[PDB]
Design a protein around this ligand. Structure first.
Ligand SMILES: Nc1ncnc2c1ncn2[C@@H]1O[C@H](COP(=O)(O)OP(=O)(O)OP(O)(O)=S)[C@@H](O)[C@H]1O
Ligand SMILES: Nc1ncnc2c1ncn2[C@@H]1O[C@H](COP(=O)(O)OP(=O)(O)OP(O)(O)=S)[C@@H](O)[C@H]1O
Ligand SMILES: [Mg+2]
Ligand SMILES: [Mg+2]
Lengths: 291, 130, 438, 425
DNA sequence: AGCAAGCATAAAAGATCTAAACATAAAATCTGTA
DNA sequence: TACAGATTTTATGTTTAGATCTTTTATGCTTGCTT
């Protein structure tokens, strides 16, 4: 029942992945046929949200649905459900059902108090093993007595001076960080994509900046400035990018999964595609990779 | 905009999204042998496109379909509203017929007023003094 | 005697204006605009001609009074030839005004002889179908108060539709819109401006003292022989208004200079006639107008001076010390620590110059600080009192202000009464009068 | 007038104005009437006395402080108006309108119209008064709600046999002065004098104090015999007078604070009564001086660790002392808000002031204690909802007064005063 | 070494807003099966 | 085979989490200066 924390200088991503997938999961599976599923959290990604992570956890291990009396008055359906998990797993054999691996737990979006509280409450469960890594030197400042008690860490020092090429992918190195935008990871994805997907993304960006210019620089993209999926289908069909809406949705699944574009339903019932990047970031994407 | 138009062309009362899909099918797919020409006047088009601008695109796009016999007459206060809301590419694709209504001059306005009082100016009346 | 009771009731219902419309009194200074209001309405209910008029005037300028008197006057002789829909911008919303119009149309049409059933789209479509289409047409009269609140900058569809009904409908529609803004025209959008007829009636103002004298004479003269005291009451009122040196004329002149509003004067006078027990007391009260002075003194009994005159020794000392530390500070701000330091310095100096004033501790001065804050002698350094809208108040309630986070001792305050004002108010015989001059 | 004016002790003008405005005739009573005054000014008391003296005036008392927002206020008005109307006229067949259907001011207008149109069977017009005790006391209050409530009476039918007349008892004059152009008739309630407060307190509390159980047991325990009707009343009046003349400066002209003080100090005052001192009030006062010398209105400040205590000490020193540590030390300015600093400076000062073992490094435990200190709000940041402790732009500050940090420093035997005595004592 | 005055400017506090998460509901429409 | 009963579709309402913005005071930098 001890969560493992790995700190040091270098990239511990390879260490954590190899330890969890190649050693931990098969060994737990044999000591308990299928291997224990591993949820690899990429905390260096600035677009890591606890809603999606908890949805993945719920999919991996199915919990009891939160009842009407347990939802409270506008209560957090994630925290209450995790407490329900804790109560359910308190009286049950202490096997291991999930191995969630937290790469770079102090990353730009994974360091926030909400997701840290989520991980703190998940750490109480003894049926999931937690193997986390931290790179920041002030990382222990994140956790008070309650969170450091729920984590129940055993700190291990693994310094290896590794390049950390994957962690540096999501933000520019030449600018020397001059972090949470996530547009650099989007561009890195954009070099390696199908030409049809690149054209569809370029059209979406162009129309979204048209909407933003109609509305008004440093403002992010929301559903207020976004394309309707029917209108986007019409545009793509006019440009031969997508034959039908099914193909367009299939293409958009990759961008939605990578947290690049979001489809959300507004008050009118329309479903709107919007890219959560600012005007300058979209212009840079069009000039650099989408030119 | 849709709930009205479909109700004016089908007699059915549908929701706005169902009406939009019905209009798309009616204009794109129904053969021209089973249709009547439609002349739609979009008075004050400024108010329709203020949040999502999809009314303009939907109503102008339906005039591009070969099967559709729609005729849209759009009225707005700004001469460049489609060029802003739709964009240059979409507006160039649609191919409008653009007309500008300049304000009246003093002579034209005087002629309007005179025609409004053609039979009454310099006329004769019987007035009951009581 | 019942005669004086009848006279007093008649006087009170003359002041309140609830006397029958056959004998309602119209002040001479506003007998002109009424004619205009009398004209337009009589050109819409009798001649069946559409009209769109906006009445601009301050609060209590007799807009609703005249607009209701005219409707009552037209009501008794043309009851079945018009219906009235009343809307108020304060209690009606953009979505809610449609429901209000539909419900009022259905109610008035059943009264003279559904539209209010369905969604907002159906209701609006039905009211457009009914209005914006031997035997004549019923005139629809819109009494539409606070027209400026429905003439916002984001969208004006109700006003647009109403003015389009005025122009392009076969049913005669009269739309009266009351507002206080002098620039109501620039509030409307250009389409609504074009649709509006630019018929703005600016309500008359009291420009003379004789106007208020005549208004008071109209208010307080009983013109119906209902009590034995009516003739003597009229004689007394006329002899108290004829001479310019009388107390009633003096108070009328003071109202003319300061307030210049008949409603304030009648509010002052209503308890004057309701308090009197017999006719002699009423005559003496109208000759001396002592109750007017009492009422005026009471009205000014909770402001800064009245609140300051109701402070204990410790609270007054703390207030003076806070005023001194705010005067010394460049920003006019202070906190509990500085104020208490100045207070204890003052108390030490006073006791040294000497039967000794007690120096209360911090725990015994926190309550005084809270009491002085409650009376709004101090406010937060940068605080918004009350938000204008409900949405702004909701947003403020959601936000957690930094002022409540910091400890009570270090909270930065700022006064409403400066040290010079304290020097002026406080009597020269006070113990702390030497300490109100920094 | 047929309206009887109650004899309120110190509200004669206010009662006269209430009788002048509030009358059973709808023609000669204002649509809106306002009662203004501060806490303890006897406005609800005066209105209750006036309405009790006149059982022929129909009143619907409402308390907006319980109804935090406007929708509960409208729903409660709609419910209570029809409930009261049913109570007065149970023989009128009426249909029930659900108060929860009132969700807009227009919905309230429509519901009130529907309720009033079914009472046309009455012979003469009546008016029921909606008293809103504390319209100023709404928690979710803006400057536009009262504008709605002023003009609410215009849209309701003019010829109805049931007239609604609103009465508001607001608290603050700053709120009332926003609506000064509406010319609403207003009755002001000035705060009481010291003599008025003393008389109110004696006439309101002497009867209860003289019948208290503690006095009942004390008189029989001390074997005393005296005039029960009068001597005990005089004793209670003298106690109230002593309380007032001792704590008037502390409380002010506040009836509630003095009532609380009387409740707190009466048992201790009566526990000091005996045979000799009851007859002479001077001796009884001299035997219980300690009661009237201290207000006593209060009902090792922290159990923090030595690391947490030294972290707080270092944070206070860092925040309230300028970054001139380089010159001499480590080898009032406290009257103002604490300044801001960084984590590294706090850690350096903590290492400097921590007792040697030869120096204390920043373990996991130190950072855990610092994060706990921020959790307990003893140390704050420039946080705005989302907070990231690891951002270089986040700066820290202290949230303890001088007394708390002084107690903490003396707990670990640290002289923070000597450090802070350079600028001022 | 140590510090006052002037300046630009990064920053704190908060107004103003959006929108996702949490929630309710009437009409239409899918779905069983007696 | 029409069905009630379960589900989806459409339409707002309530509340929390997160954003950008203006407005105003703190702040490092520069200039001038003496220990
Ligand atoms: N229907 C009415 N009958 C008699 N007197 C009335 C009537 N309506 C208002 N009054 C009185 O007329 C005086 C002022 O006239 P109002 O019409 O109320 O003011 P106003 O012009 O409506 O100002 P607004 O509407 O608040 S901008 C007050 O003393 C009111 O009590
Ligand atoms: N004139 C008076 N005569 C006798 N007792 C009074 C008098 N005025 C106030 N009191 C008493 O003092 C207290 C005052 O209570 P309230 O009249 O309710 O105060 P208030 O003016 O309503 O202030 P708030 O805003 O309601 S807290 C009650 O216990 C009354 O019994
Ligand atoms: Mg009015
Ligand atoms: Mg009260």
């Amino acid at each position: 029942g001890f969560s493992l924390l790995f700190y040091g200088v270098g990239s511990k991503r390879n260490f954590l992945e190899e330890f969890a997938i190649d050693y931990l999961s098969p060994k737990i599976a044999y000591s308990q046929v299928n291997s224990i599923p591993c949820l690899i959290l990429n905390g260096y990604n600035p677009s890591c949200n606890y809603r999606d992570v908890f949805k993945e956890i719920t999919d991996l291990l199915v919990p009891a649905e939160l009842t009407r009396s347990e939802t409270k008055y506008w209560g957090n359906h994630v925290i209450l459900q995790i407490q329900k998990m804790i109560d359910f797993y308190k009286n049950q054999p202490l096997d291991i059902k999930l191995i969630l691996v937290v790469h770079n737990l102090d990353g730009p979006s994974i360091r926030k108090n909400t997701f840290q509280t989520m991980l703190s409450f998940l750490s109480v469960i003894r049926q999931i093993a937690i193997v986390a890594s931290t790179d920041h030197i002030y990382a222990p400042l994140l956790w008070d007595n309650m969170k450091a008690q729920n984590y129940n860490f055993v700190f291990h020092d693994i310094s290896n001076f590794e390049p950390s090429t994957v962690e540096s992918t999501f933000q520019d190195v030449m600018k020397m960080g001059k972090t949470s935008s996530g547009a650099e990871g989007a561009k890195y994805v954009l070099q390696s994509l199908t030409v049809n997907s690149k054209k569809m993304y370029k059209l979406l960006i162009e129309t979204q900046m048209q909407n933003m210019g109609n509305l008004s620089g440093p403002k992010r993209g929301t559903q207020r400035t976004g394309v309707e999926l029917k209108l986007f289908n019409h545009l793509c069909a006019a440009d031969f990018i997508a034959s039908n809406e099914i193909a367009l949705r299939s293409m958009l699944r990759e961008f939605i999964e990578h947290k690049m574009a979001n489809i959300t339903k507004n008050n009118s019932g329309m479903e709107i595609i919007w890219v959560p990047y600012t005007y300058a970031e979209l212009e840079k994407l069009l000039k650099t990779v989408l030119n | 905009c849709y709930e009205t138009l479909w109700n004016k062309v089908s007699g059915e009362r549908l929701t706005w999204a169902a009406s939009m899909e019905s209009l798309e099918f009616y204009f794109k797919r129904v053969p021209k042998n089973k249709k009547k020409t439609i002349v739609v006047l979009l008075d004050e088009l400024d108010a329709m496109v203020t949040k999502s601008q999809d009314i303009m695109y939907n109503f102008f796009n339906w005039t591009t379909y070969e099967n559709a016999k729609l005729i849209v007459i759009a009225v707005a206060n700004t001469m460049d509203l489609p060029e802003r809301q739709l964009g240059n590419k979409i507006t160039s694709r649609i191919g409008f017929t653009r007309i500008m209504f300049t304000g009246y001059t003093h002579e034209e306005l005087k002629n309007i007023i005179d025609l409004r009082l053609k039979g009454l100016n310099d006329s004769f009346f019987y007035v009951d003094t009581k | 005697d019942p005669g004086f009771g009848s006279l007093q009731r008649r006087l009170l219902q003359q002041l309140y204006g609830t006397l029958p419309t056959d004998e309602k009194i119209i002040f001479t200074y506003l007998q002109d605009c009424q004619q205009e209001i009398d004209r337009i309405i009589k050109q819409s209910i009798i001649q069946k001609e559409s009209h769109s008029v906006i009445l601009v005037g301050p609060r209590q300028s007799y807009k609703t009074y005249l607009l209701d008197y005219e409707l009552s006057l037209l009501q008794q002789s043309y009851k079945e030839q018009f219906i009235t829909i009343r809307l108020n911008g304060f209690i009606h919303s953009e979505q809610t005004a449609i429901n209000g119009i539909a419900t009022q149309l259905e109610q008035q049409l059943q009264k003279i002889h559904t539209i209010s059933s369905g969604s907002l789209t159906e209701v609006f479509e039905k009211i457009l179908l009914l209005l914006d289409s031997s035997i004549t047409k019923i005139t629809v009269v819109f009494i539409f108060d606070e027209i400026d609140t429905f003439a916002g900058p984001v969208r004006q569809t109700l006003l647009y539709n109403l003015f389009d009904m005025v122009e392009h409908s076969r049913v005669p529609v009269c739309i009266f819109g009351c507002t206080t803004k002098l620039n109501i025209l620039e509030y409307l959008e250009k389409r609504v401006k074009s649709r509006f007829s630019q018929r703005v009636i600016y309500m008359p103002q009291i420009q003379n003292l004789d106007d208020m004298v005549d208004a008071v004479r109209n208010l307080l003269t009983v013109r119906s022989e209902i009590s034995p005291w009516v003739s003597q009451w009229n004689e007394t009122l006329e002899k108290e208004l004829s001479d310019p040196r009388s107390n009633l004329n003096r108070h009328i002149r003071m109202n003319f200079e300061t307030f210049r509003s008949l409603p304030t004067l009648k509010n002052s006078i209503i308890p004057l006639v309701a308090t009197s027990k017999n006719f002699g007391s009423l005559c003496t009260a109208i000759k001396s107008c002592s109750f007017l002075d009492i009422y005026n003194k009471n009205q000014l009994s909770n402001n800064l001076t009245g609140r300051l005159q109701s402070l204990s020794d410790l609270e007054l000392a703390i207030l003076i010390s806070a005023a001194r530390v705010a005067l010394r500070a460049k920003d006019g701000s202070f906190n509990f620590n500085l104020a208490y330091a100045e207070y204890e310095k003052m108390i030490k100096a006073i006791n040294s110059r000497i039967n000794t004033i007690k120096l209360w501790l911090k725990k015994d001065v926190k309550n005084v600080w809270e009491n002085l804050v409650q009376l709004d002698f101090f406010t937060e350094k940068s605080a918004v009192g009350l938000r204008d809208n409900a949405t702004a108040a909701f947003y403020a309630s959601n936000y957690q202000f930094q002022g409540t986070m910091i400890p009570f001792d270090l909270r930065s305050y700022q006064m409403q009464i400066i040290l010079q004002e304290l020097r002026r108010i406080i009597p020269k015989s006070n113990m702390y009068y030497s300490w109100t001059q920094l | 007038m047929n309206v009887t004016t109650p004899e309120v002790a110190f509200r004669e003008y206010q009662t006269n104005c209430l009788a002048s405005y509030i009358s059973a005739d709808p023609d000669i009573t204002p649509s809106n009437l306002i009662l203004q005054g501060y806490s303890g000014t006897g406005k609800t008391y005066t209105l209750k006395k006036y309405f009790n003296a006149n059982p022929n005036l129909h009143a619907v008392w409402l308390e907006p402080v319980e109804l935090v927002s406007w929708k509960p206020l409208l729903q409660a008005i709609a419910r209570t108006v029809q409930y009261k109307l049913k109570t007065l006229y149970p023989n009128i067949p009426t249909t029930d309108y659900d108060p929860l259907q009132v969700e807009e001011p227009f919905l309230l207008v429509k519901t009130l119209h529907n309720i009033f149109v079914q009472y046309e069977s009455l012979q003469e017009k009546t008016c029921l008064f909606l008293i809103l005790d504390g319209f100023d006391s709404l928690q979710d209050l803006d400057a536009a709600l009262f504008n709605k409530y002023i003009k609410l009476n215009e849209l309701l039918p003019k010829d109805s046999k049931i007239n609604i007349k609103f009465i508001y008892t607001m608290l603050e004059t700053s709120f009332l002065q926003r609506y000064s152009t509406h010319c609403i008739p207003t009755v002001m309630f000035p705060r009481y004098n010291v003599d008025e407060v003393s008389t109110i307190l004696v006439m309101s509390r002497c009867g209860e104090l003289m019948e208290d159980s503690c006095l009942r047991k004390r008189i029989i325990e001390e074997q005393i015999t005296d005039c029960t009707d009068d001597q005990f009343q005089n004793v209670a009046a003298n106690f109230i007078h002593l309380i007032v003349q001792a704590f008037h400066s502390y409380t002010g002209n506040d009836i509630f604070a003095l009532n609380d003080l009387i409740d707190f100090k009466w048992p201790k005052y009566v526990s000091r009564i005996t045979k000799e001192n009851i007859f002479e009030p001077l001796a009884l006062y001299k035997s219980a001086i300690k009661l009237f010398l201290s207000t006593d209105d209060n009902l090792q400040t922290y159990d923090l660790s030595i690391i947490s205590k030294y972290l707080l000490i270092a944070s206070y020193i860092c925040s309230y002392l300028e970054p001139r540590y380089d010159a001499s030390i480590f080898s009032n300015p406290r009257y103002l808000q604490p300044s801001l600093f960084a984590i590294e400076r706090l850690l350096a000062i903590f290492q400097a002031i921590f007792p040697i073992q030869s120096l204390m490094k920043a373990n996991i435990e130190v950072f855990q204690n610092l994060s706990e200190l921020h959790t307990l709000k003893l140390i704050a940041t420039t946080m705005n909802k989302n907070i990231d402790y690891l951002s270089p732009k986040v700066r820290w500050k202290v949230n303890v007064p001088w007394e708390i940090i002084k107690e903490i420093s003396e707990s670990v035997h640290f002289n923070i005063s000597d450090y802070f005595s350079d600028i001022h004592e």
